Design a protein around this ligand. Structure first.
Ligand code: HEM
Ligand SMILES: C=Cc1ccccc1
Length: 435
């Protein structure tokens, strides 16, 4: 079978279609028009965009397809090197760092992060308790303050102190300008390097037994090779986790809140759970695990707007995809996750409705139908960290405040490496429950 291809532009082929600030949303509309698979060509390259669970289930076969570095990740690799997200599976440092860092996301490790997640969650609740009458909240801005502080503190024992600031941290500013200006740069790379230096120097100076992610980066040994990470790769991993560890979680929290204010019955059901479960001034680990409906809200927000919306794969060998599309070794595929998550054959006709109850019986979901954390051994290592943080925080938000969509906010999805509802604002009226 011959694959459909969207409109072309002479020798530029399909390239000009990506000349937009919202390329994923542009590719979603192309998928709506052309279906489960289309060819996308640019001078010198081809990729195939997949949107159905029928095809993505095969693409996720690790015997046949491995993670490819997208154009975006190739650029990110200029700063994150062979850290986990930007390494090829076949690079020695991928498996080495994978093995060393996996224990930093075990159940025991998650329980270890809980108190420091609460520290930051409490700073967010106090900020909003302290606003004057009629003041509003800039949602993605505050969520980014919380998620950046949480990975800094939990992962590295470093305080970004984002809630003490009006404009984001110089690390964040430098990380954007500096990569930006790769597709002053001197002073920016210096901001990044200095911070990495400091995170390392301070742990080394401290007379501190710690079992955090940094501790594993610095001291853990890979059981396979028996080697620890070398200093160059540790730096890459710190950069990798400071970024990967916060931007997509902030997106998720922002979309979740957006969907709750747009669906007041769902908000009321989630708020009732928060009030029933979170019976103490501080949530416990056990109580966060009992926020089942809040977890479903989060999953349903990842269904509609997965905040890392695409991942790339290459064919390990010549193979046939879906009984119909022959591929050659090296051929690239792109999984368009928001489109996968709208596959009517899986989810029913109401795919654009926000209905967390879709996730009541998750064993009913077919293989590879829901992929917001990627696939296989190259799946998100931080999935449980993101979900624990976002469950804790959204549960606290719903326990402490009523929310108003006071502007009747029109969804505007800004695309970076991640997705966010740009300009999303709300008002939060305190329920006056002490911390
Ligand atoms: C809701 C929030 C998050 C989402 C949706 C998400 C999504 C993803 C996706 C789709 C991938 C696969 C990328 C690819 O195949 O190219 C990935 C990998 C990765 N993520 Fe996450 N992520 C989230 C949060 C986090 C957090 C909190 C951390 C760190 C604490 C993190 C660290 C990583 C790392 C290191 C990888 C690379 C793993 C490897 O290839 O070995 N992510 N993530
Ligand atoms: C936030 C985890 C992650 C990793 C790679 C790309 C986008 C997101």
């Amino acid at each position: 079978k011959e694959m459909p291809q969207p409109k072309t532009f002479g020798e530029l082929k399909n390239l000009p279609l990506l000349n937009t600030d919202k390329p994923v949303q542009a590719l979603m509309k192309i998928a709506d028009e052309l279906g489960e698979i289309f060819k996308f060509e640019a001078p010198g390259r081809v990729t195939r965009y997949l949107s159905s669970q029928r095809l993505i289930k095969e693409a996720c076969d690790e015997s046949r397809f491995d993670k490819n570095l997208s154009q975006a990740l190739k650029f990110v690799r200029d700063f994150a090197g062979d850290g986990l997200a930007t390494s090829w599976t076949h690079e020695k440092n991928w498996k080495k760092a994978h093995n060393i860092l996996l224990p930093s996301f075990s159940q025991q490790a998650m329980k270890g992060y809980h108190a420091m997640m609460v520290d930051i969650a409490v700073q967010l609740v106090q900020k909003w308790e302290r606003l004057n009458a009629d003041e509003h909240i800039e949602v993605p801005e505050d969520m980014t303050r919380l998620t950046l502080d949480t990975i800094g503190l939990c992962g590295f024992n470093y305080r970004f102190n984002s809630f003490y600031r009006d404009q984001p941290h110089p690390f964040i500013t430098s990380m954007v300008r500096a990569l930006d200006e790769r597709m002053q740069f001197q002073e920016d790379i210096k901001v990044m390097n200095d911070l990495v230096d400091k995170i390392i120097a301070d742990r080394k100076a401290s007379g501190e037994q710690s079992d955090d992610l940094l501790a594993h980066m610095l001291n853990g040994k890979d059981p396979e090779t028996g080697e620890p990470l070398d200093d160059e790769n540790i730096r890459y991993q710190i950069i990798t986790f400071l970024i990967a560890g916060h931007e997509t979680t902030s997106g998720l929290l922002s979309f979740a809140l957006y969907f709750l204010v747009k669906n007041p019955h769902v908000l009321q059901k989630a708020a009732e759970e928060a009030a029933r479960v979170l019976v103490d001034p501080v949530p416990s680990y056990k109580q966060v695990k009992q926020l089942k409906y809040v977890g479903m809200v989060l999953n349903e927000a990842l269904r509609l707007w997965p905040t890392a919306p695409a991942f790339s794969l290459y064919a390990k060998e010549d193979t046939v995809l879906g009984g119909e599309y022959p591929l050659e070794k090296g051929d690239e595929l792109m999984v368009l996750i928001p489109q996968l998550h709208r596959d009517k054959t899986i989810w029913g006709d109401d795919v654009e409705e926000f209905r967390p109850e879709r996730f009541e019986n998750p064993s009913a979901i077919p293989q590879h139908a829901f992929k917001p954390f990627g696939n296989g051994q190259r799946a998100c290592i931080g999935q449980q960290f993101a979900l624990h943080e976002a469950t804790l925080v959204l549960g606290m938000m719903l326990k402490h405040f009523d929310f108003e969509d006071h502007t009747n906010y029109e969804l505007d999805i800004k695309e970076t490496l991640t997705l966010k509802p740009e300009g999303f604002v709300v008002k939060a009226k305190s329920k006056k429950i002490p911390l």
